[PDB]
Coordinates of C-alpha atoms and ligand atoms in Angstrom, one line a residue:
Chain C
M5 CA -21.8 -38.2 17.8
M6 CA -20.1 -35.0 16.3
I7 CA -17.4 -32.9 17.6
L8 CA -16.8 -29.5 16.0
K9 CA -14.1 -26.8 16.2
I10 CA -14.8 -23.1 15.0
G11 CA -11.6 -21.6 13.7
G12 CA -10.5 -18.3 14.9
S13 CA -9.9 -17.4 11.2
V14 CA -13.7 -17.3 10.8
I15 CA -15.0 -15.9 14.0
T16 CA -12.4 -13.2 14.3
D17 CA -10.5 -10.7 12.1
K18 CA -7.0 -12.3 12.6
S19 CA -5.3 -9.0 11.5
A20 CA -6.8 -6.8 14.2
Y21 CA -6.4 -7.5 18.0
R22 CA -9.5 -8.5 19.7
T23 CA -11.8 -8.0 16.8
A24 CA -14.7 -10.5 16.4
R25 CA -16.9 -11.3 13.5
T26 CA -20.2 -11.3 15.4
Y27 CA -22.2 -12.1 12.5
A28 CA -20.1 -15.3 11.8
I29 CA -20.5 -16.5 15.5
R30 CA -24.2 -15.9 15.3
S31 CA -24.9 -17.8 11.8
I32 CA -22.5 -20.5 12.7
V33 CA -23.9 -21.2 16.1
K34 CA -27.5 -21.1 14.6
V35 CA -26.5 -24.1 12.5
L36 CA -24.8 -25.8 15.4
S37 CA -28.0 -25.5 17.6
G38 CA -29.9 -27.8 15.0
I39 CA -27.2 -30.6 15.0
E40 CA -28.7 -33.2 17.3
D41 CA -25.6 -35.3 18.1
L42 CA -23.2 -32.4 18.5
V43 CA -21.4 -33.4 21.8
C44 CA -18.6 -30.9 22.0
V45 CA -17.6 -27.5 20.6
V46 CA -13.9 -26.1 20.5
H47 CA -12.9 -22.8 19.1
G48 CA -9.6 -20.9 18.2
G49 CA -8.7 -17.7 19.3
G50 CA -7.3 -15.6 16.2
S51 CA -6.9 -12.1 17.2
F52 CA -8.0 -12.8 20.7
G53 CA -5.0 -15.0 21.7
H54 CA -2.3 -15.0 18.8
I55 CA -1.3 -11.3 18.9
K56 CA -0.8 -11.0 22.7
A57 CA 0.9 -14.4 22.8
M58 CA 3.5 -13.3 20.3
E59 CA 4.0 -10.0 22.0
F60 CA 4.4 -11.5 25.4
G61 CA 6.5 -14.6 24.5
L62 CA 3.9 -17.4 24.7
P63 CA 4.4 -20.2 24.4
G64 CA 7.8 -19.9 26.0
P65 CA 10.0 -19.7 29.1
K66 CA 8.4 -18.3 32.2
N67 CA 9.6 -14.7 33.0
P68 CA 7.7 -11.9 34.4
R69 CA 6.7 -10.6 30.9
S70 CA 5.3 -14.0 29.9
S71 CA 3.7 -14.2 33.2
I72 CA 1.7 -11.2 32.8
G73 CA 1.0 -12.3 29.1
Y74 CA -0.5 -15.4 30.3
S75 CA -3.1 -13.5 32.4
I76 CA -4.0 -11.2 29.4
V77 CA -4.2 -14.1 26.8
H78 CA -6.4 -16.2 28.9
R79 CA -8.7 -13.2 29.7
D80 CA -8.9 -12.4 26.1
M81 CA -9.7 -15.8 25.2
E82 CA -12.6 -15.8 27.9
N83 CA -14.0 -12.6 26.2
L84 CA -14.1 -14.4 22.8
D85 CA -15.4 -17.5 24.4
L86 CA -18.3 -15.5 26.1
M87 CA -19.6 -14.4 22.7
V88 CA -19.9 -18.0 21.5
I89 CA -21.6 -19.0 24.7
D90 CA -24.0 -16.0 24.4
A91 CA -25.1 -17.2 20.9
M92 CA -25.4 -20.7 22.0
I93 CA -27.5 -19.8 25.0
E94 CA -29.8 -17.6 22.6
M95 CA -30.4 -20.7 20.4
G96 CA -31.4 -22.7 23.5
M97 CA -28.5 -24.8 23.7
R98 CA -26.9 -25.9 27.0
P99 CA -23.3 -24.8 26.7
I100 CA -20.7 -24.7 29.5
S101 CA -17.2 -23.5 29.0
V102 CA -14.5 -25.8 30.3
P103 CA -11.2 -24.0 29.8
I104 CA -8.0 -26.2 29.3
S105 CA -6.4 -23.6 31.8
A106 CA -8.5 -25.0 34.6
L107 CA -7.9 -28.7 34.1
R108 CA -5.3 -31.0 35.8
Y109 CA -2.3 -31.5 33.6
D110 CA 0.7 -34.1 34.0
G111 CA 1.7 -34.1 30.4
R112 CA -1.7 -34.7 29.2
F113 CA -5.1 -32.9 30.3
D114 CA -7.6 -34.5 32.5
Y115 CA -10.8 -33.9 30.7
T116 CA -12.9 -35.7 33.3
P117 CA -14.9 -32.5 33.8
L118 CA -15.9 -32.3 29.9
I119 CA -17.0 -35.9 29.8
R120 CA -19.1 -35.5 32.9
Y121 CA -20.8 -32.5 31.4
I122 CA -21.4 -34.6 28.0
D123 CA -23.1 -37.3 30.3
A124 CA -25.3 -34.8 32.1
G125 CA -26.5 -33.5 28.8
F126 CA -24.4 -30.2 28.3
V127 CA -22.5 -29.3 25.3
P128 CA -18.9 -28.5 26.8
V129 CA -17.1 -25.5 24.9
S130 CA -13.4 -25.4 25.1
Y131 CA -10.8 -23.3 23.2
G132 CA -7.0 -22.7 22.4
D133 CA -5.7 -21.5 25.7
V134 CA -2.4 -21.1 27.7
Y135 CA -1.5 -23.6 30.3
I136 CA 1.4 -24.3 32.6
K137 CA 3.6 -26.9 30.8
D138 CA 6.0 -27.2 33.7
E139 CA 7.6 -25.0 36.6
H140 CA 9.6 -22.8 34.0
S141 CA 7.4 -23.0 30.9
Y142 CA 4.0 -21.8 29.6
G143 CA 2.4 -23.6 26.8
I144 CA -0.3 -22.6 24.3
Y145 CA -2.8 -25.7 23.6
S146 CA -4.4 -24.9 20.2
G147 CA -8.0 -25.8 19.5
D148 CA -6.6 -28.4 17.0
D149 CA -4.8 -30.0 19.8
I150 CA -7.9 -30.2 21.9
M151 CA -10.0 -31.4 19.0
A152 CA -7.4 -34.3 18.5
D153 CA -7.7 -35.1 22.4
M154 CA -11.5 -35.2 22.0
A155 CA -11.4 -37.4 18.9
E156 CA -9.2 -40.0 20.9
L157 CA -11.3 -39.8 24.0
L158 CA -14.8 -39.8 22.6
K159 CA -14.2 -41.7 19.2
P160 CA -17.1 -39.5 17.7
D161 CA -18.4 -40.6 14.3
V162 CA -17.7 -37.4 12.8
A163 CA -15.3 -34.3 13.4
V164 CA -15.8 -30.9 11.6
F165 CA -13.3 -28.1 11.4
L166 CA -14.6 -24.7 10.1
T167 CA -12.2 -22.3 8.7
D168 CA -12.5 -19.3 6.4
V169 CA -11.8 -21.3 3.1
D170 CA -13.9 -24.0 1.3
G171 CA -11.6 -26.9 2.5
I172 CA -8.0 -28.0 2.4
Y173 CA -6.4 -27.1 -1.0
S174 CA -3.3 -28.3 -2.8
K175 CA -1.7 -24.9 -1.7
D176 CA -2.9 -21.8 0.2
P177 CA -5.7 -20.7 -1.9
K178 CA -5.2 -17.1 -0.8
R179 CA -1.5 -16.9 -2.1
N180 CA -2.3 -19.2 -5.1
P181 CA -5.0 -18.4 -7.5
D182 CA -4.2 -21.8 -9.1
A183 CA -4.7 -23.8 -5.9
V184 CA -7.3 -26.7 -6.2
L185 CA -9.7 -27.8 -3.6
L186 CA -9.1 -31.3 -2.3
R187 CA -12.5 -33.1 -2.0
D188 CA -11.1 -36.3 -0.4
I189 CA -8.0 -37.2 1.3
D190 CA -6.8 -40.5 2.4
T191 CA -4.7 -41.5 5.5
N192 CA -1.6 -42.8 3.6
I206 CA -2.1 -25.6 7.5
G207 CA 0.6 -28.2 7.7
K208 CA 0.4 -28.7 11.4
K209 CA -3.3 -28.6 11.3
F210 CA -3.5 -31.0 8.5
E211 CA -1.2 -33.5 10.3
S212 CA -3.3 -33.7 13.4
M213 CA -6.6 -34.0 11.3
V214 CA -5.1 -36.9 9.4
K215 CA -4.2 -38.4 12.7
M216 CA -7.6 -38.0 14.2
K217 CA -9.1 -40.1 11.5
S218 CA -8.0 -43.3 13.3
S219 CA -10.3 -42.2 16.1
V220 CA -13.2 -40.9 14.0
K221 CA -15.4 -43.6 12.2
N222 CA -16.9 -41.7 9.4
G223 CA -14.8 -38.6 8.5
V224 CA -12.8 -35.7 9.6
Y225 CA -14.2 -32.6 7.5
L226 CA -13.0 -29.2 6.7
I227 CA -15.8 -26.9 5.7
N228 CA -15.9 -23.2 5.1
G229 CA -17.3 -21.5 8.4
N230 CA -18.8 -18.7 6.3
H231 CA -21.0 -21.6 4.9
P232 CA -22.2 -23.4 8.1
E233 CA -25.2 -24.8 6.2
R234 CA -22.7 -27.1 4.4
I235 CA -22.5 -29.1 7.6
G236 CA -25.9 -30.4 6.6
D237 CA -24.8 -31.2 3.0
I238 CA -22.4 -33.9 4.3
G239 CA -23.2 -36.9 2.0
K240 CA -24.8 -35.0 -0.7
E241 CA -23.5 -34.5 -4.3
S242 CA -23.9 -30.9 -3.5
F243 CA -21.5 -31.1 -0.7
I244 CA -18.6 -28.4 -0.7
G245 CA -15.6 -29.3 1.6
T246 CA -13.0 -31.6 2.2
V247 CA -13.2 -35.1 3.9
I248 CA -10.4 -37.1 5.3
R249 CA -11.7 -40.7 5.1
Chain X
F3 CA 4.0 -10.9 55.5
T4 CA 0.7 -12.5 56.3
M5 CA -0.8 -14.9 54.0
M6 CA -4.2 -13.9 53.3
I7 CA -7.3 -15.0 51.3
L8 CA -9.9 -12.5 50.8
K9 CA -13.6 -12.8 49.5
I10 CA -15.3 -9.7 47.4
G11 CA -18.9 -10.1 48.4
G12 CA -21.4 -9.5 45.6
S13 CA -23.3 -7.2 48.0
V14 CA -20.5 -4.5 47.2
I15 CA -19.6 -5.2 43.6
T16 CA -23.1 -5.6 42.3
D17 CA -26.4 -3.9 42.8
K18 CA -28.1 -6.8 44.2
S19 CA -31.6 -5.6 43.4
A20 CA -30.9 -4.9 39.6
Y21 CA -30.0 -8.0 37.3
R22 CA -26.3 -8.0 36.0
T23 CA -25.6 -4.6 37.6
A24 CA -22.0 -4.2 38.9
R25 CA -20.4 -1.3 40.8
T26 CA -17.3 -0.4 38.9
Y27 CA -15.8 2.1 41.1
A28 CA -16.2 -0.3 44.0
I29 CA -14.4 -2.9 42.0
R30 CA -11.5 -0.6 41.0
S31 CA -11.2 0.7 44.5
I32 CA -11.0 -2.8 46.1
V33 CA -8.6 -4.0 43.4
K34 CA -6.2 -0.9 44.0
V35 CA -5.9 -2.2 47.7
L36 CA -5.6 -5.9 46.6
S37 CA -2.8 -5.0 44.4
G38 CA -0.7 -3.7 47.3
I39 CA -1.2 -6.8 49.4
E40 CA 2.2 -8.7 49.8
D41 CA 1.0 -12.3 50.0
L42 CA -2.5 -12.3 48.6
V43 CA -2.8 -16.1 48.2
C44 CA -6.4 -16.3 46.8
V45 CA -9.2 -14.1 45.9
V46 CA -12.9 -15.3 45.8
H47 CA -16.1 -13.1 44.9
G48 CA -19.7 -13.7 45.3
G49 CA -22.5 -12.9 42.7
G50 CA -25.0 -10.5 44.1
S51 CA -27.2 -9.7 41.0
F52 CA -25.1 -11.7 38.7
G53 CA -26.2 -14.9 40.4
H54 CA -28.9 -15.0 43.1
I55 CA -31.5 -13.4 40.8
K56 CA -31.7 -15.8 38.0
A57 CA -30.6 -18.8 40.1
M58 CA -33.8 -18.6 42.4
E59 CA -36.0 -18.0 39.2
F60 CA -34.3 -21.2 37.4
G61 CA -34.7 -23.5 40.3
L62 CA -31.1 -23.5 41.2
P63 CA -29.9 -25.2 43.3
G64 CA -32.5 -27.9 42.9
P65 CA -33.4 -30.8 40.7
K66 CA -32.5 -31.2 37.1
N67 CA -35.3 -30.2 34.6
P68 CA -34.9 -28.4 31.3
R69 CA -35.5 -25.0 33.1
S70 CA -32.8 -25.5 35.6
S71 CA -30.4 -27.0 33.0
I72 CA -30.6 -23.9 30.7
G73 CA -30.6 -21.9 34.0
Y74 CA -27.1 -23.7 34.7
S75 CA -25.6 -22.3 31.5
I76 CA -27.0 -18.9 32.1
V77 CA -26.0 -18.6 35.6
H78 CA -22.5 -19.7 34.9
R79 CA -22.3 -17.3 31.9
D80 CA -23.4 -14.2 33.9
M81 CA -21.0 -15.2 36.8
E82 CA -18.0 -15.3 34.2
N83 CA -19.2 -11.9 33.1
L84 CA -19.0 -10.5 36.3
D85 CA -15.7 -12.2 37.3
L86 CA -14.1 -10.6 34.0
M87 CA -14.8 -7.3 35.5
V88 CA -12.8 -8.1 38.4
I89 CA -9.9 -9.7 36.3
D90 CA -9.9 -6.7 34.0
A91 CA -9.3 -4.4 37.0
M92 CA -6.6 -6.6 38.4
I93 CA -4.6 -6.7 35.1
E94 CA -5.1 -3.0 34.8
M95 CA -3.5 -2.5 38.1
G96 CA -0.4 -4.7 37.5
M97 CA -1.7 -7.9 39.1
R98 CA -1.4 -11.7 37.6
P99 CA -4.8 -13.0 38.2
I100 CA -6.2 -16.3 36.6
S101 CA -9.7 -17.3 36.9
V102 CA -10.3 -20.9 38.1
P103 CA -14.1 -21.6 38.1
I104 CA -15.6 -24.1 40.5
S105 CA -17.6 -25.5 37.7
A106 CA -14.8 -26.6 35.7
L107 CA -13.2 -28.5 38.7
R108 CA -13.6 -32.4 39.1
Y109 CA -16.0 -33.1 42.0
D110 CA -16.7 -36.3 43.9
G111 CA -18.2 -34.8 47.1
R112 CA -15.3 -32.3 47.2
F113 CA -13.9 -30.2 44.6
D114 CA -10.2 -31.1 43.2
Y115 CA -8.6 -27.7 43.7
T116 CA -5.3 -29.0 42.2
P117 CA -5.2 -26.4 39.4
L118 CA -5.7 -23.6 41.8
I119 CA -2.6 -24.9 43.9
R120 CA -0.6 -25.1 40.7
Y121 CA -1.3 -21.5 40.0
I122 CA -0.5 -20.2 43.4
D123 CA 2.8 -22.2 43.2
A124 CA 3.5 -20.6 39.9
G125 CA 3.1 -17.1 41.2
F126 CA -0.5 -16.2 40.2
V127 CA -3.3 -15.0 42.1
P128 CA -6.1 -17.4 41.5
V129 CA -9.5 -15.8 41.3
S130 CA -12.6 -18.0 42.0
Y131 CA -16.4 -17.4 42.6
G132 CA -19.7 -18.7 43.7
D133 CA -20.8 -21.1 40.7
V134 CA -23.1 -23.8 39.7
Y135 CA -21.9 -27.5 39.7
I136 CA -23.4 -30.9 39.1
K137 CA -24.2 -32.2 42.5
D138 CA -25.4 -35.7 41.2
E139 CA -27.2 -37.3 38.3
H140 CA -30.4 -35.5 39.3
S141 CA -29.4 -32.3 40.9
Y142 CA -27.5 -29.1 40.5
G143 CA -26.0 -27.1 43.2
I144 CA -24.7 -23.6 43.9
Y145 CA -21.4 -23.5 45.7
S146 CA -21.2 -19.9 47.3
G147 CA -18.2 -17.8 47.6
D148 CA -18.3 -18.4 51.3
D149 CA -18.1 -22.2 50.7
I150 CA -15.2 -21.7 48.4
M151 CA -13.5 -19.5 51.3
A152 CA -14.0 -22.3 53.8
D153 CA -12.4 -24.8 51.4
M154 CA -9.6 -22.5 50.9
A155 CA -8.9 -21.7 54.5
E156 CA -8.7 -25.6 55.2
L157 CA -6.4 -26.3 52.1
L158 CA -4.2 -23.2 52.4
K159 CA -4.1 -22.4 56.1
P160 CA -3.7 -18.7 55.5
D161 CA -2.7 -16.4 58.5
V162 CA -5.8 -14.1 57.8
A163 CA -9.3 -14.4 55.9
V164 CA -11.0 -11.2 54.9
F165 CA -14.6 -11.1 53.8
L166 CA -15.7 -7.8 52.3
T167 CA -19.4 -6.8 52.4
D168 CA -21.3 -3.6 52.0
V169 CA -21.7 -3.1 55.9
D170 CA -18.9 -2.5 58.5
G171 CA -19.1 -5.9 60.2
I172 CA -21.4 -8.3 62.0
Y173 CA -24.1 -6.3 64.0
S174 CA -26.2 -7.4 66.8
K175 CA -29.1 -7.1 64.3
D176 CA -29.4 -6.2 60.6
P177 CA -27.8 -2.5 60.3
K178 CA -30.0 -1.5 57.4
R179 CA -33.3 -2.5 59.0
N180 CA -32.8 -1.1 62.6
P181 CA -30.7 2.1 63.4
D182 CA -30.0 0.9 66.9
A183 CA -27.9 -2.1 65.8
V184 CA -24.4 -2.3 67.3
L185 CA -21.1 -3.4 65.6
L186 CA -19.6 -6.6 67.1
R187 CA -15.8 -5.9 66.9
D188 CA -14.6 -8.8 68.6
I189 CA -15.8 -12.4 68.5
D190 CA -13.8 -14.7 70.7
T191 CA -14.5 -18.2 69.4
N192 CA -13.4 -19.7 72.6
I193 CA -16.8 -18.7 74.2
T194 CA -20.5 -19.6 73.3
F195 CA -21.8 -16.7 71.2
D196 CA -25.0 -15.1 72.3
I206 CA -25.6 -13.5 57.2
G207 CA -26.3 -16.3 59.7
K208 CA -24.8 -18.9 57.3
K209 CA -21.9 -16.7 56.6
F210 CA -21.3 -16.3 60.2
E211 CA -21.4 -19.9 60.8
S212 CA -18.9 -20.7 58.3
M213 CA -16.4 -17.9 59.4
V214 CA -16.5 -19.5 62.7
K215 CA -15.5 -22.9 61.3
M216 CA -12.8 -21.5 59.2
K217 CA -11.1 -19.8 62.2
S218 CA -9.6 -23.2 63.2
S219 CA -7.7 -23.3 59.8
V220 CA -6.8 -19.5 60.1
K221 CA -4.1 -18.6 62.3
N222 CA -4.6 -14.9 63.1
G223 CA -8.2 -14.3 62.5
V224 CA -11.1 -13.9 60.2
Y225 CA -12.2 -10.5 59.5
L226 CA -15.3 -8.9 58.1
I227 CA -14.9 -5.4 56.7
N228 CA -16.9 -2.8 54.7
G229 CA -15.9 -3.3 51.1
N230 CA -16.7 0.4 50.6
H231 CA -13.8 1.0 52.8
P232 CA -11.2 -1.3 51.6
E233 CA -8.3 0.7 52.9
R234 CA -9.6 -0.8 56.3
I235 CA -7.7 -4.0 55.3
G236 CA -4.5 -2.2 56.0
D237 CA -5.6 -1.7 59.6
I238 CA -5.9 -5.2 60.5
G239 CA -3.9 -5.5 63.7
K240 CA -4.2 -1.8 64.5
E241 CA -6.2 -0.6 67.3
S242 CA -7.6 1.7 64.5
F243 CA -9.4 -1.2 62.7
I244 CA -13.2 -0.8 62.0
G245 CA -14.8 -4.1 61.3
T246 CA -15.5 -7.6 63.0
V247 CA -12.7 -9.9 64.0
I248 CA -13.4 -13.6 64.8
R249 CA -10.4 -14.9 66.8
Ligands
ATP301 N1 -3.3 -26.1 1.7 C1 -4.1 -25.1 2.4 N2 -5.5 -25.4 2.2 C2 -6.4 -24.5 2.8 N3 -6.0 -23.2 3.5 C3 -4.6 -23.2 3.7 C4 -3.6 -24.0 3.1 N4 -2.3 -23.5 3.4 C5 -2.6 -22.4 4.0 N5 -3.8 -22.2 4.3 C6 -4.4 -21.0 5.1 O1 -5.0 -21.6 6.2 C7 -5.9 -20.6 6.7 C8 -6.7 -21.4 8.0 O2 -5.7 -21.5 8.8 P1 -5.8 -21.0 10.5 O3 -4.7 -21.6 11.3 O4 -6.1 -19.6 10.5 O5 -7.2 -21.7 10.8 P2 -8.0 -21.7 12.3 O6 -8.2 -23.1 12.9 O7 -9.2 -20.8 11.9 O8 -7.1 -20.9 13.4 P3 -7.2 -20.9 15.0 O9 -6.1 -21.6 15.5 O10 -7.0 -19.2 15.4 O11 -8.6 -21.5 15.4 C9 -6.8 -20.4 5.5 O12 -7.1 -19.0 5.7 C10 -5.7 -20.4 4.5 O13 -5.4 -19.0 4.0
ATP302 N1 -26.6 -9.0 61.9 C1 -26.1 -8.4 60.7 N2 -25.0 -7.9 60.8 C2 -24.5 -7.3 59.5 N3 -25.3 -7.4 58.4 C3 -26.4 -8.0 58.3 C4 -27.0 -8.7 59.6 N4 -28.1 -9.1 59.2 C5 -28.4 -9.0 57.9 N5 -27.3 -8.3 57.4 C6 -27.1 -8.0 55.9 O1 -26.2 -8.8 55.3 C7 -25.8 -8.2 54.0 C8 -24.6 -8.8 53.6 O2 -24.7 -10.1 53.4 P1 -24.6 -10.9 52.0 O3 -25.0 -12.4 51.9 O4 -25.0 -10.0 50.8 O5 -23.0 -11.0 51.9 P2 -22.1 -11.1 50.5 O6 -20.8 -12.0 50.8 O7 -21.9 -9.7 50.0 O8 -23.1 -12.0 49.5 P3 -22.6 -12.7 48.1 O9 -21.1 -12.5 47.9 O10 -23.0 -14.1 48.3 O11 -23.5 -12.1 47.0 C9 -25.8 -6.7 54.4 O12 -26.1 -5.9 53.3 C10 -26.6 -6.6 55.7 O13 -27.7 -5.8 55.2
IP8_303 C1 -4.6 -18.9 23.2 C2 -4.2 -18.8 21.6 C3 -3.2 -18.1 21.2 C4 -5.1 -19.4 20.6 C5 -4.9 -20.9 20.4 O1 -5.8 -21.4 19.6 P1 -5.9 -21.6 18.0 O2 -6.5 -20.2 17.8 O3 -6.8 -22.8 17.7 O4 -4.5 -21.7 17.4
IP8_304 C1 -23.7 -18.7 41.6 C2 -24.3 -17.9 42.5 C3 -25.6 -17.8 42.6 C4 -23.3 -16.8 43.4 C5 -23.2 -17.8 44.8 O1 -22.1 -16.9 45.5 P1 -22.4 -15.8 46.8 O2 -23.0 -14.6 45.9 O3 -21.1 -15.9 47.4 O4 -23.4 -16.4 47.6

């Protein structure tokens, strides 16, 4: 079994509100459709939740501004999600979105509906989303959070994160011409990296970070040729 | 105030003959009325051409096979697209909607609507819609917007339930087919009575709905404001 997250940095233009990279969505999903053991797909939001979230005070205390922002951020995320769902349906996949915003929550989310779908043969699709954290607070659960939950619940053999760079580097490669790709990380981007390292305890054969602009690399896992990072 | 739940029929917000064909002005016009309702607790909508068309063609509801399974994804996708048109209008007009789809709820014979209760309690207007669900290991179901309205009457005990369709109310026969049909304005549930399934379920609902279940022409949504009034045009079930 594989679980996989598509980063918002690769399927959206993060700098421009509600701006998708449709060709990246299509070319990633074309590859995802050939992965036989792919049981769950998560994606991030990029410019479809982070801009309105900041603008409306999410995550944060409930007030009439964040309450309206909650509606907008969730709606925007559905719009992005439907573009991923459309490409999956085109490739003959059997996707079904299960938003975090629709799950029971008591401090952790009741994912029973995603598990039921996996058992019935669907590929549940979920994404970084708003939720009601408590009677006076709205949270944002990111796609990395959801991936950590899914690792713990499913104990998949492999987890893949797609971002818009080749892997985890020593430093942000966009700022730092001298940054070096880290091919292999052991268990003994900072927030993302922490939770990936922590996922490895639930993922038998590796948590990978791969360039979503090179989705074909998912199939090079194991080969010399492989370009990417593995946490192992 | 009255606590109202309301269903927007697909017959009024879709062109039921033409696949994925919505009626945008009807949607905006209805939503303008909704945004002025003081205690609108819940909104449901049906699918018209964003559901019944594909569903029937894919064998939904029915046994699981690869056509109905792909069909499941597609019907749910299309339903979401229609729903988003409704959500977009509501957001444009100052409302706080949040979609809560039946296909994402736990089901064991009934649906666990807990997430929807949480949103009502938090001051949102949850919006749900007729949708696909896994009925058992071998079967896929379709839970219509009428079924969701029935679940909501019982769960929430609203004062009023309103169904919007593309005709004025229940007639003695199909109004579109025969020009001699007459509008039945008043249906006393205490008597034996002289869209069949819809009618059945509205009558069942009325025990959970304190002050009446109404059927109103969704092309005339201002009529919602004339509930109570002797000026109201529509069917009431009391
Ligand atoms: N050490 C590092 N290695 C690799 N990338 C880094 C590092 N530090 C910072 N970055 C930046 O992290 C970015 C990816 O982070 P980002 O949070 O956008 O990923 P994402 O999962 O696509 O986001 P989303 O939450 O929208 O899904 C890269 O574009 C890179 O510029
Ligand atoms: N006796 C009757 N009285 C009123 N309308 C009738 C009658 N018999 C048939 N109809 C037809 O019922 C239609 C509305 O029923 P319909 O099932 O479309 O409701 P709806 O809630 O809009 O559907 P959905 O929301 O499931 O897509 C009308 O267009 C009308 O032609
Ligand atoms: C709803 C928002 C803001 C997106 C959260 O998801 P991420 O994009 O994985 O951080
Ligand atoms: C999922 C489908 C087909 C819609 C069911 O809802 P209705 O249109 O209210 O009967």
